[PDB]
Paper text:
Receptor-binding specificity of HA is a key determinant for viral host range. HA molecules of human viruses preferentially bind to α(2,6)-linked receptors, those of avian viruses to α(2,3)-linked receptors, while those of swine viruses to both. Two H6 HA proteins, one from each group, were chosen for structural and functional investigation: A/chicken/Guangdong/[name]/2010([name]) (GD H6) in Group I and A/Taiwan/2/2013(H6N1) (TW H6) in Group II.
The GD H6 virus, although of chicken origin, was able to infect guinea pigs through direct inoculation or contact. GD H6 HA has an apparent equilibrium dissociation constant of 0.097 μM for avian-like 3’SLNLN receptor, and 5.0 μM for human-like 6’SLNLN receptor. The overall ~50-fold lower binding affinity of GD H6 HA with 6’SLNLN receptor, compared to 3’SLNLN receptor, seems mainly the result of an about 20-fold decrease in the association rate. In the structures, we observed five glycans (at HA1 21, 33, 169, 291 and HA2 154) for both H6 HAs. The glycan at HA1 169 is located at the HA1-HA1 monomer interface, which was reported to protect H6 HA from trypsin cleavage at R201. The overall structures of GD and TW H6 HAs are very similar, where the root-mean-square deviation (RMSD) for all Cα atoms is at 0.67 Å. Within the receptor-binding site, GD and TW H6 HAs differ at multiple key locations. These include HA1 S133, S136, S137, I155, P186, V187, E190, A193 and G228 for GD H6 HA, whereas R133, T136, N137, V155, L186, D187, V190, N193 and S228 for TW H6 HA. Nevertheless, the amino-acid composition of HA1 S137, E190, and G228 in the receptor-binding site of GD H6 HA allows the binding to both human- and avian-like receptors, albeit with a slight preference for avian-like receptors.
Residue numbers in the entry:
A (entry chain C), B (entry chain E), C (entry chain A): 1 to 324
D (entry chain D): 1 to 173
E (entry chain F): 1 to 176
F (entry chain B): 1 to 171
The structure:
Amino acid sequence: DKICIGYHANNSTTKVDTILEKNVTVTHSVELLENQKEERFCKISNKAPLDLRDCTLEGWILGNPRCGILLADQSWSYIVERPNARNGICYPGTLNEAEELKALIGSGERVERFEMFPKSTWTGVNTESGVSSACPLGNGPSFYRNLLWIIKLKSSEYPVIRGTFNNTGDKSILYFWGVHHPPVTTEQNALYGSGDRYVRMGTESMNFARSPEIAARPAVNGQRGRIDYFWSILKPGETLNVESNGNLIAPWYAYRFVNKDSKGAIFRSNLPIENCDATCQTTEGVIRTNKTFQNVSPLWIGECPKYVKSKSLRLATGLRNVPQ
Amino acid sequence: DKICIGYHANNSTTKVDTILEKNVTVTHSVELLENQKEERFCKISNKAPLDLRDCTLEGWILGNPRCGILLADQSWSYIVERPNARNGICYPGTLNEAEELKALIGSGERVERFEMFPKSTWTGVNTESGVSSACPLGNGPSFYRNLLWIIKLKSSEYPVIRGTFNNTGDKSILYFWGVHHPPVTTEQNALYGSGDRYVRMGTESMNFARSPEIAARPAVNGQRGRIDYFWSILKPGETLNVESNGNLIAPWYAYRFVNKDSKGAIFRSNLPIENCDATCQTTEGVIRTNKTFQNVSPLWIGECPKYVKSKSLRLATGLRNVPQ
Amino acid sequence: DKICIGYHANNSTTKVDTILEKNVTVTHSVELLENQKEERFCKISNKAPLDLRDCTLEGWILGNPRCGILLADQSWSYIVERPNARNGICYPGTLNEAEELKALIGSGERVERFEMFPKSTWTGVNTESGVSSACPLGNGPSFYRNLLWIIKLKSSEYPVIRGTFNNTGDKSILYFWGVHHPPVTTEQNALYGSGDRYVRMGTESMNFARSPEIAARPAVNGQRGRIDYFWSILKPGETLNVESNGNLIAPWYAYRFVNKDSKGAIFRSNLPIENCDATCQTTEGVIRTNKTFQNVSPLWIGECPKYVKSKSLRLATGLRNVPQ
Amino acid sequence: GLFGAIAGFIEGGWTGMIDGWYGYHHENSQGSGYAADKESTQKAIDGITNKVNSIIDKMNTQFEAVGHEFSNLERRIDNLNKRMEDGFLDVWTYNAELLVLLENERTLDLHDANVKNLHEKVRSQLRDNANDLGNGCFEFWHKCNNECMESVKNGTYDYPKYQKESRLNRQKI
Amino acid sequence: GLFGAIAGFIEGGWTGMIDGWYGYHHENSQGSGYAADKESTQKAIDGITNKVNSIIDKMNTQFEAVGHEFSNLERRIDNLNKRMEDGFLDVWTYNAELLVLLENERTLDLHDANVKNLHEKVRSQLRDNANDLGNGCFEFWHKCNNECMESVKNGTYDYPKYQKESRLNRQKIESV
Amino acid sequence: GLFGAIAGFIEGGWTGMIDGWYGYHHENSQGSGYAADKESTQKAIDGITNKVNSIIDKMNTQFEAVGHEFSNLERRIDNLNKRMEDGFLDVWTYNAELLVLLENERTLDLHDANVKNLHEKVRSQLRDNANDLGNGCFEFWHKCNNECMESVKNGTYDYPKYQKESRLNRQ
Ligand SMILES: *[C@@H]1O[C@H](CO)[C@@H](O[C@@H]2O[C@H](CO)[C@@H](O[C@@H]3O[C@H](CO)[C@@H](O)[C@H](O)[C@H]3NC(C)=O)[C@H](O)[C@H]2NC(C)=O)[C@H](O)[C@H]1NC(C)=O
Ligand SMILES: *[C@@H]1O[C@H](CO)[C@@H](O[C@@H]2O[C@H](CO)[C@@H](O)[C@H](O)[C@H]2NC(C)=O)[C@H](O)[C@H]1NC(C)=O
Ligand SMILES: *[C@@H]1O[C@H](CO)[C@@H](O[C@@H]2O[C@H](CO)[C@@H](O)[C@H](O)[C@H]2NC(C)=O)[C@H](O)[C@H]1NC(C)=O
Ligand SMILES: *[C@@H]1O[C@H](CO)[C@@H](O[C@@H]2O[C@H](CO)[C@@H](O)[C@H](O)[C@H]2NC(C)=O)[C@H](O)[C@H]1NC(C)=O
Ligand SMILES: *[C@@H]1O[C@H](CO)[C@@H](O[C@@H]2O[C@H](CO)[C@@H](O)[C@H](O)[C@H]2NC(C)=O)[C@H](O)[C@H]1NC(C)=O
Ligand SMILES: *[C@@H]1O[C@H](CO)[C@@H](O)[C@H](O)[C@H]1NC(C)=O
Ligand SMILES: *[C@@H]1O[C@H](CO)[C@@H](O)[C@H](O)[C@H]1NC(C)=O
Ligand SMILES: *[C@@H]1O[C@H](CO)[C@@H](O)[C@H](O)[C@H]1NC(C)=O
Ligand SMILES: *[C@@H]1O[C@H](CO)[C@@H](O)[C@H](O)[C@H]1NC(C)=O
Ligand SMILES: *[C@@H]1O[C@H](CO)[C@@H](O)[C@H](O)[C@H]1NC(C)=O
Ligand SMILES: *[C@@H]1O[C@H](CO)[C@@H](O)[C@H](O)[C@H]1NC(C)=O
Ligand SMILES: *[C@@H]1O[C@H](CO)[C@@H](O)[C@H](O)[C@H]1NC(C)=O
Ligand SMILES: *[C@@H]1O[C@H](CO)[C@@H](O)[C@H](O)[C@H]1NC(C)=O
């Protein structure tokens, strides 16, 4: 008659690492790291992401004429931008504070597109024929859908034009405008006129004035001229006064902006968007797990496990497995 | 006859947490985290803080006429700014590089207020009558006490005016100036004159130039015109040359600046400043403790315990309490 | 007859610290922290660093005439600038985005110096006599070797001058230019002329335009005038158009640029550069060790041990030393 | 450190005990069998579960990198942002990887200590009524039936009850 | 890592021993009483004091957030500063909270080991001159006065001195 | 915690045992000597080597500060960069210094456990065939030759072989 004290053993071949010894077989363990992903984009919080498709972010928000598929109100859980999108800023020039613009929009939830200044705002001028071959739609010349290129009538001078927008809404307004820099004095006199010309934009918190800098630049899309693009935020209760005697690329349509109450994301990716739902969406794909860590990507939206470089993080729960 | 080996027990109900077990009653323990604060501001290093009262930081150093209580020599341990102080930049406009200025002043300990350019510096112009209802002193209209608004005599033209300050002291000088932007050309010609006008400042290390940007703006404090405010540091041994043919808001009084040899602070708070002393001053109040951690605030100036999110950090010192 | 169980002891007096006890003598231990350095600079990956000697980074890359020994092709593993080098920006003025320039070059490996615009590029103007006593070479006045100071012909006006460079290589081109700001209107008329003057640079991705800002400034290096220096990168396949009717400091020589595929470094130090080899090169000197940590410097190039403040980090390997 | 039981003086584990981590094997006139000690096993499960849950809970925040963009004139703050993102990545990678190594050790040693304590608990009841074989087994100096075995496992073993039968078997040998 | 003594084979603690953490309770003709072992107790006190001080000492630096302000066109570096400050806050919270959990375990286990070792220390001297009750107590097979009691705690117990008297009293009580 | 052996019931170490960390000293008619325990010494070396290597390997990344420069109008991002660099410096200093304290404790205790376990391994075989002096030594109740000593070290000591001879010595 005898009694023995002993411990459990089983058929586990699962191994963990310890400080004193590596690859130790244990009876029970739990994996904390997730390395599996679905390579695709799904919906976050029952909201579809915005695919910018063949348009860049600037091309979308400025209304590049080939971006018509996007020309509407937009509500996104997040934004997917495609690496090689062809439709950007079609007419050559710099958008001032471009990176800050992307950060603002990325921090957004929804934008509502509306007409800020109708063509009837600007009187004594040609509101048509504001197009260029640099911004083609099909073969024919066109222009941005959120901007109005105003040129002088062939008959008269370019009169002082004025516009006013009082933001009486509760929502901030994102709007855009520009200053045209024709390549030669010929075009400046033909499009707007001689003498000192000006573009004047202002609100309670902003004062903007510029004059044309006439210069011949290397050709981009057949253009030696340039447009300096600008963007700004008209706060609720603020009012915008526009004053110009020439070279104004006027705000036409603008956006009422809705701040996202959490972190937003803009993903640069080739992955397909499908009809699916996700709690955790990374730029590399969807993660579905109850695990604590993940091997997929540092860039994500929603509720994701912590990103680490580890290939495995396995906690021992059971004991050293010693079968007989 | 017998002898027994055993361990201490007491009347303690104090509990600590362990990795294997929560709520373990132990005989002796020490709390490492401090949650207590005196909601008030005291002196750091026996030097009183500066209460900005009803003035914003910009309103103070620019010398808003309603900030008169603050326009003098100041030596502070730290600065307290009140959330809703009404007296800011009274005449509408942008302070250029405002946030860097706030950062500079926060890193300072003392300023000495002195008259840099007396009114007699600018001759052939009206150095009086440079006041506005937007910047009232008492009931009557006025202007900043560190700035001089120069307007043209109608008798003569606006002459090219010049001023010079050679900084022969050991202390750096913080000074301010501005460019006036009238709402309409009428006022520009009436206050300064026709043609291209300019404001030009220069030192051994700085070169500054601007021209008036005339624009029609929404009224702020009864003013549709604007002033672009600027600030700079005149290093010891450096010299400032001022040259302008119009639209100049000239430096009047300035501050000799003394850099703090350690971290300075600017607190946004409603808490009362009282007659007391503190080693550790947070933005949420005073901490008096020997403890290693605190959950009160990440923002503080004196010698404070490390900030964490924890509700409690209690180390076991004695043993598991097991009374019989 | 007897047998005893026991443990090793020796003459070791080496001590380690534990959580329960300090100064504990152990039989065997290993020091993980390295405090030793060779105060000098060696080769990283068998490639020598660039010694800037008596020239500042700006003075070198702009081509200060006293920096001639460095005006050639250069290949560096890293760059050493000497604290008090005399040859800097000799003609007084600001290098725009200087810190971004230093950061870019630090991320570089090699520069190839070539002539971008020869003096014959600019027609109707004087390309000689473009020198100053502020930038002396020997006793005679001189100027930068990468810049051309263009002045009006004695006989004719300053014509609109133009230049074009098409970058057909695979490497980006680093180039420099400037705008001269005379102290008084007199010199402006004498060197360039009256009326509106401009300096205009443009590429497919860049738009630059400036005007002269005439102002009286304190003398620096015998000069009350200033030059605003600028730098930019001509991308492969891009084109630079230069357009000016005056006040232009023209690009002359530029650099073909090679981007470093890893982090580069710029050390500001007096330490000697020698022909030797190092795996780990800090700004304070060379570290040769198998140890895991070092207290020498946070700033280094190559493969270095982790930087900490510790004086010693010694792990016990053997046991508590208890001689008989 | 090692408590000497697991892969120690008890040379191996039992694949025949499937209901618990620590337990018994008995032999008598009524046959043999394995039985898990449910008290010590459950206490271990509660402790390990708490350890795992507590570790997960302290790891329950995330540093979140963002996809913000920087111009060619923003190289410094770009590089700053990257060194920060890599900075916290390395700290949390270190924390996670090292915590797993150290605590896996502690967990395995914990099981060892539990087996050891269980072995001494039994040794203490039997005293000289049983022969300690040094391998974790005890030979009884008396007949120990199923109920007798239960009392040992359940910890209610009556020592003086079997003492005389035990000593007479030590006397005759 | 339990050493099996505290809330172990020694089932409970003594509220009657107030001068130390670990100690003795004796019984003889001269009466009973509690006495702390000052050696093992003092050594533990030094160690725990050292642990707490060392922990406090390594926690003796602070990440200090600042109240710098950023414009509406500085959104990126504003968020950068915020993610950094929250970054170290989460790191130090992790470090602090987890360390308290882990080391509280160690400290409690340490006391357990001390009680166990003190117990083995006594058991080693008494050998078969005393009856191990398994609960932490030893019944002497001989008369042990105060001077005898002192030697046990102090570790100078004379085993062969009591050997003969003890062996006769194991024989006398057994029925063989 | 302490396992009670090192500087414990075994009061001191042996300067005479040079071939290992843990071991034996034996005495009989064939002479005397120190001998390292071959099993436990190697296993301890393997574990500690693994511990040291594992620690070094987890410390095998570096936060690298840069020598980037900032203008007088960049004071905020300058200070941002400094607080970050000092931030990680303080984190890693904390980690390194505290890890050394905690693991040095563990390493010393590891040896202690190894010595105790080595002592119980021997105590368990000898049983009542030997007299436990409590200081780590065992006096044999029978003649124990060199091969007998070896059997103890191998952990193969034959208890019933010497059982009767030991027991008969009762004065
Ligand atoms: C640890 O070991 C012993 C625990 O009691 C102590 O040694 C005994 O201490 C006695 C008490 O002081 C000593 O007293 C001697 O004997 C009688 C007491 O019976 C005294 O009156 C005498 O003055 C004194 N000397 C003589 C010659 O009688 C004894 O020396 C001793 N007894 C025996 C049997 O050894 C140690 O002192 C103690 N160490 C401490 C407390 O530090
Ligand atoms: C979280 O998920 C894990 C793994 O996805 C689940 O793990 C299991 O725990 C149960 C406990 O009874 C075991 O029976 C399973 O065998 C475990 N899974 C594996 C793969 O071994 C776990 O169920 C989930 N969390 C909870 C609380 O149940
Ligand atoms: C540990 O101790 C805390 C003491 O606050 C216990 O907290 C109570 O638990 C109940 C539910 O069990 C909850 O209402 C609250 O968390 C507490 N109630 C109070 C303070 O009135 C907790 O239950 C204990 N056990 C754990 C956390 O497992
Ligand atoms: C760095 O290399 C040295 C070799 O010079 C290592 O030190 C040796 O380690 C062996 C193995 O324990 C000893 O026998 C030698 O006596 C040691 N030589 C010394 C200390 O000078 C050292 O361990 C290495 N360090 C690291 C961190 O890898
Ligand atoms: C030393 O110990 C080993 C085992 O640890 C002994 O080898 C064993 O010998 C027995 C026969 O008595 C076999 O049943 C085992 O299978 C052997 N073990 C192995 C691992 O093969 C060895 O004989 C011992 N040496 C001496 C001199 O006694
Ligand atoms: C191991 O044995 C168990 C019990 O029968 C069962 O899960 C299966 O047979 C084996 N497990 C695996 C994963 O093969
Ligand atoms: C331990 O880890 C894995 C086991 O799956 C293996 O890749 C690795 O090579 C092992 N290490 C050694 C030293 O065998
Ligand atoms: C805009 O409308 C509001 C109505 O609330 C009015 O009070 C305000 O004066 C208007 N702004 C301007 C510039 O007229
Ligand atoms: C008894 O306990 C109370 C609280 O539980 C404590 O404040 C007190 O100091 C203890 N000792 C006493 C009352 O002697
Ligand atoms: C004033 O500046 C001039 C140079 O413009 C020079 O004499 C000196 O730096 C200053 N004067 C004195 C007396 O220090
Ligand atoms: C150090 O080693 C020497 C030489 O073996 C020996 O005397 C002793 O172990 C130590 N020396 C002293 C003076 O303690
Ligand atoms: C340990 O060694 C040095 C000796 O100066 C010092 O750190 C300290 O005084 C010593 N003692 C302790 C307890 O640290
Ligand atoms: C630059 O040169 C290339 C020659 O390979 C030519 O194809 C391209 O059109 C040129 N770009 C110009 C002239 O703008």
